[PDB]
Design a protein around this ligand. Sequence first.
Ligand SMILES: [Mn+2]
Ligand SMILES: [Mn+2]
Ligand SMILES: [Mn+2]
Ligand SMILES: [Mn+2]
Ligand SMILES: [Mn+2]
Ligand SMILES: [Mn+2]
Ligand SMILES: [Mn+2]
Ligand SMILES: [Mn+2]
Lengths: 439, 439, 439, 439
Amino acid sequence: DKLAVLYAEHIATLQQRTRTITEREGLEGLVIHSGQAKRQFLDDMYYPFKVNPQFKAWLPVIDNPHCWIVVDGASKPKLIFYRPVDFWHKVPDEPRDFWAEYFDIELLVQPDQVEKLLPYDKANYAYIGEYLEVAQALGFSIMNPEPVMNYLHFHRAYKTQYELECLRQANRIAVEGHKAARDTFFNGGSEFDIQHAYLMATRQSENEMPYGNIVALNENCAILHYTHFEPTAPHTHHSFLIDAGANFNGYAADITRTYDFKKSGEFSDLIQVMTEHQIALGKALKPGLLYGELHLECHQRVAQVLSDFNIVKLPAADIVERGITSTFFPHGLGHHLGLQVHDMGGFMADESGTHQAPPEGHPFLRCTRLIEKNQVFTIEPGLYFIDSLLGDLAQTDNKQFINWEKVEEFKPFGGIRIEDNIIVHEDSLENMTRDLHLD
Amino acid sequence: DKLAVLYAEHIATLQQRTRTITEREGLEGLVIHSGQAKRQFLDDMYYPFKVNPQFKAWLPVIDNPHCWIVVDGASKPKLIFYRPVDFWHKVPDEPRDFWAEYFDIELLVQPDQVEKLLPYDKANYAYIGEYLEVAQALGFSIMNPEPVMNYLHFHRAYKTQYELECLRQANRIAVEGHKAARDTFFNGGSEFDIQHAYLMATRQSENEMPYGNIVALNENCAILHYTHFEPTAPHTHHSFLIDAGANFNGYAADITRTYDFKKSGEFSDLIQVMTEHQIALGKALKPGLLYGELHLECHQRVAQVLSDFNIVKLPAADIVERGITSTFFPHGLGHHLGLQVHDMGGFMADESGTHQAPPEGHPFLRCTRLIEKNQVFTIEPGLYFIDSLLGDLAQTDNKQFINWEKVEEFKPFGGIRIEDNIIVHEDSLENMTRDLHLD
Amino acid sequence: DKLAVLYAEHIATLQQRTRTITEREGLEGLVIHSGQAKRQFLDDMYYPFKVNPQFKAWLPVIDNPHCWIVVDGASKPKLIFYRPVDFWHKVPDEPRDFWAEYFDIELLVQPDQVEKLLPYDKANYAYIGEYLEVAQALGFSIMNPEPVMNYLHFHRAYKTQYELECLRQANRIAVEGHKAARDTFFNGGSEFDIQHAYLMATRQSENEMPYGNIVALNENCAILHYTHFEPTAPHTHHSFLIDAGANFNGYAADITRTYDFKKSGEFSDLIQVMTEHQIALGKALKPGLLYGELHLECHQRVAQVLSDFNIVKLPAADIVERGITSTFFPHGLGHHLGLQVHDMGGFMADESGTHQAPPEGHPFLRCTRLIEKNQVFTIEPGLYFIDSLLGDLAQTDNKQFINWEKVEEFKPFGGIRIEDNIIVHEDSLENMTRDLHLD
Amino acid sequence: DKLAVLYAEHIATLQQRTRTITEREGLEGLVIHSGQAKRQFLDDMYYPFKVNPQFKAWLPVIDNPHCWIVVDGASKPKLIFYRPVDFWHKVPDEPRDFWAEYFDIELLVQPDQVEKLLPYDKANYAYIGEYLEVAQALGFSIMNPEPVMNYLHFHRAYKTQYELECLRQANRIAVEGHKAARDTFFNGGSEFDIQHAYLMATRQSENEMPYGNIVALNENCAILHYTHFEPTAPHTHHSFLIDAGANFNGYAADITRTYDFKKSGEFSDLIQVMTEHQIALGKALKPGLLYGELHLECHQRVAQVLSDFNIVKLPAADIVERGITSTFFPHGLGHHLGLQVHDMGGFMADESGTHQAPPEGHPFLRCTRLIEKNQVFTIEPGLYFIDSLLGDLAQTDNKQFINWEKVEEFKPFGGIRIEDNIIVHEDSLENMTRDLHLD
Ligand SMILES: [Mn+2]
Ligand SMILES: [Mn+2]
Ligand SMILES: [Mn+2]
Ligand SMILES: [Mn+2]
Ligand SMILES: [Mn+2]
Ligand SMILES: [Mn+2]
Ligand SMILES: [Mn+2]
Ligand SMILES: [Mn+2]
């Protein structure tokens, strides 16, 4: 109904985008491959299927390989839809969903008989997909050409109204998970118990999550890419960090929340100050401003928190210029969000694919691109107590400046990250995460 | 300590098998590659890791890519063990578990720094792994030679005592899952709720499962490769079929049970009668018998049930000779079980790789090989009410013989399968599943 | 094959222990004598053969005298095997059991032709055996020296996985006995019929039993060391108490069960709660705990049962404080079990041999030693109505605290003992008896 | 009542025998020790009690150690009777049996205090017992003096009218036993099953048996000291050799029978012929004939059977001269029987102890002594096909003579032995075995 309608402009929007770049590069159209299931070595099991982002761009079909889109930006889009008819599979209906009518559908019953339903002459058609050799075998010659990719990847930054609804919906699901996650941390459950409380509340499986959820207690908070889910709970609960999203129609939420168990004490106050910095950095988004500048203001804000709590025995500004903040805040402030979690385009200046330079002493910044309307961002300010980095700084001459007596008090809490998913409109911001009553 | 003691003899066995086939095929040794992480197309997210079965045949390291085993059956096996030390990950400990003692362990910090740690001259070493291009770049020319793969796959039928213990231990975990899934069925939970109770009880995540679990309610029970998990319950609970295992040290369990929701009933009775055949089929495993024959026996048994219950209006003997049983029982009785769920060597007559022909009527049978001691099997007799297969039979000259009214009564219950994991001993059968008092 | 595989580590372990103690005490090795058959005074009949425990420690040859072991913990163990070849006995083919390969076996034809095969200079060998006058005669000087006996007896508490499997296997057999014995009790069989049913089911003779079975009906249950087997049944069957085990490869089961003839009654109730105390006392075994204390914990469990059943008219705590419990429960809770029923090392705190003080309440205790993993225990809590012991309590201060009217009610039923055999693991207890599903 | 009256003559008959030898050797009397329970090496378990034959020659007390008889052959004998009073054993009744009134009974409650109930001056008393060390401690100087031993042993050959009833009561029991044994053989029971049917029917334990029953099937029959009891039955049933007795009041039976499973064939005929010969040997007992000759007569009969059946080509008498009957009949013909199975005196010429010479050909014989009245005997004529002896025969110049094709047809049946317990009278014979109609 609501989403169904917003889709019509989605198509038109893409249809145009296709026309522009097809006709510009001398192509008669694109052929976009959802992809294939990957078989495990020597085995008859498969890896969980992951759809070509460039395919699901067009429609919410994320769970079906051997699917093909042919589009030129002029003719109605033709879709080749894998619907096999074996007795061991639930024979699903012919596509009668909202997106169906917007495509010329042909049913493919066996993955090898595609070679007939694709254009006879594939000399001016671009294959957009992973399986290069499977392409060649079919007749294709042009395969993922950089101008088409660079161009398509630039305009992915600009979401249609359909996309923006999808992302809103993804956050709604995620937020529900986060509440169930939070509640089981206060009951004293294990990492494993929490992860499965989240999945339970989202009503999504481990493999539907758009990224592997990070569910950390105590020290594990500090570990940024903490994958493991400890089945037994710790002897004592101090801190809980969860970074977990959800899927809707190919679009990802991405929400991080840190919690103190005692709701009081130095760590409790540390999160609340960081929250203040987060929300502020959340509102600082506006078109015209380069994303890199918010990243510089984040280091400024952390430096302040490090000064005020006497983790570092220096004024805010001296902490920044010395390069100390990077030990406690080693990662980007955030990134574009959408079909892919770390979404495409966030480094680009123009549709050619030209790189937008990163600032000051942060040459690895994820998202540096000029903020515009219809762009969706993450805001992930972090403050961590990581041993390997604290160890590296201990060797460095800055060692004298660090209050190690304070650091050691915090190590059992691990660290903090707070992440929201923000839409930038023309004269307003839509904090999708905070608009849904998640503290 | 028990597992540890069995493991010395595991190494001795594999060293001997390795010495036999390397000598036999003119090889100086062989190099077994754990595998790599697969990056998703155009993305920075990866697929879940899946260790090379040939790698995990040696030791229970299933979570670690960029690991290499160099082995000739005479020298102490060399283990190149991936252990990166980055600040965003929890530093893993140097391998110190029971198996470490049995390998000369060198640590590998960067995957591409492996060049220096493999044999200088890879002339007569066979690479065993998925990643052929990498093998070539490193200088290997022999890769997965059929003679070696066939030999190893043949002898994988004969479990060491180490392996049988692993498999036992796997069953033990899976049963905890089965118990919890059953209880939540009888409390009127959804397919999803059930699945997540299984995960909760076994304390293993979705991707730790040896295979995608099948959690079906009522009508989904007839769908053999049912993968979906309905978040919402059906309105009325009739039947529940769960086929789900567990991992221990790289060895799978593989258990199916069917339940009726009501205490009693027609389907209730069909379950227990089917259960009676499954036990008897389980007991009919005896060395020097061709598995194929038990499959034939299964068809006889399934016929008797179809006759007795008045689903088909013929005597059991007519039902087999008319071909009717296939419609209700279309798959194999079972398979070898081990490192792989459909384990290697199961179609083999000898260690060259030569096929053992299956029975005339069912030429698509999995397990055809001569039963022997120290082999582990499944026994999955089934009776399903499958639409596409029933339709097909309504077209044939057997339509008159089917009680379509009684077939319609059962359709809401879907189908039945009951699967156990049995080790075959010299003068006894150990039914790992039933020893654990699951019912 | 399972036990065969475990044996390897067994030999290793014993070798290590031998080498440790033989070096420590300046011994070049030790000689371990199986024993001899004892002739009956003035007769040409012999007593039944009872192999030296120190001999069977190494291998399961328990029915052969004139066998010798020479070991230093380093060189391959020598076995002098007695193999007489006269027409009047069945000459079995040379040793080819799973243990053969581990020994340099030299055949002995005549027991007095052994001096040829033993070390010429016996100065630094210790003789371990009973037959001292034979030791001296062959040239031995050191015999059963305390330093060595003590060491071997201390580490006998730590069972190899082989030894644990042996002990499980003995329980398997014993349990078959207890079922048959229980059954013929309920069929109104005599003590003699029960015994012979036990032997019939265990498929072991009287002389193969690791101890003289206790098989007691009615009032005989009150007699702790009841060796008689009354051939005619009593007039009424009230109670039955069987303490009986089995042999496997030289290791002992030691199970006790008591039953009421009617399933109902007060005595019946008493069994049920004694059972519940016995189970709990079973689960209370833990590494880092003096068995001593578990003995006391029993006493207060016993008192509570006497309180709850109007046998003693005091609150639990005072009952144990007076010394009332020791009349109804006049023996130890249990003992180490292994090669010997009351296995060695039970009361030592160190491998020197020095004692482990019993609690202040009782200085009679068999087993006082600090519990650890890979140690096997009996839990024999009991409550009896012995006249003699009740007669002494009549002649003391606490005489007017007892319910003589209630005691006479129980005296037809004799008493209760409930004995299990439990292996202590690191983070679990394995109750061998109850794992086999004898109630 | 019946044997209660024959006891007084028994006592008296001994009182004389004593007086005679005590007077003659100049001793004030004898002290006869029942014995002691032997402790197992390093253990708290004991061997089963075996009573001093000399102690049980007076009365039937076979179950009780630490009993002492003081007897001079003049006064009424004294009996120290072990009667402990502890809470772990049944306290039995003060002797009130048919022998108690003939002894001045003194009660012993603790073995340690026996040197106070015995004579002050032990200088002129002989200790008769096994425990030479315990004697010295008590003060005895004379121990087991040969003149006395030889005398009592000589006269043991002459049974009192009491002793002859006892051995009649033992034979009654054994034969019930033997019937069960035969029945379960035909029913296809194992050696173990047969043995326990025997013990069940006799209502006596293994250790109550006067000797180790020999229960042999098939090829085991050829084995003379076959002690094993095979728990599983053999493939096919052919033959069955049992040699098992019983006990009454310290007096042994000793009966052997052989059977054929088919009641027809050549082996069935060989038994039948051998049992005629056996009965004819059992009738050829006459006072005044030296047993030595019966053996020779025996050897000449077996010879006949070896010529009749084509085992040996030669005629009866040549067989005997060539010495070849010692290959098929290599043991004695029989022996005196009483308190001990191979009873005392059977090699003695007179009461001094001088040995009666055995027949020239066979110095290796038990019984050589002249047959007289009141002397009980065994006749064990045997024919066996023993590989050991038949190997010694084929490597001599008598190979040619025997029929090797024929022996190989009998080897499956092993051998034959038939044994009866006969009282020799003045003008009659009393075959106690066959008088109770066992065939
Ligand atoms: Mn995130
Ligand atoms: Mn993010
Ligand atoms: Mn299966
Ligand atoms: Mn399965
Ligand atoms: Mn015990
Ligand atoms: Mn016991
Ligand atoms: Mn005999
Ligand atoms: Mn005899």
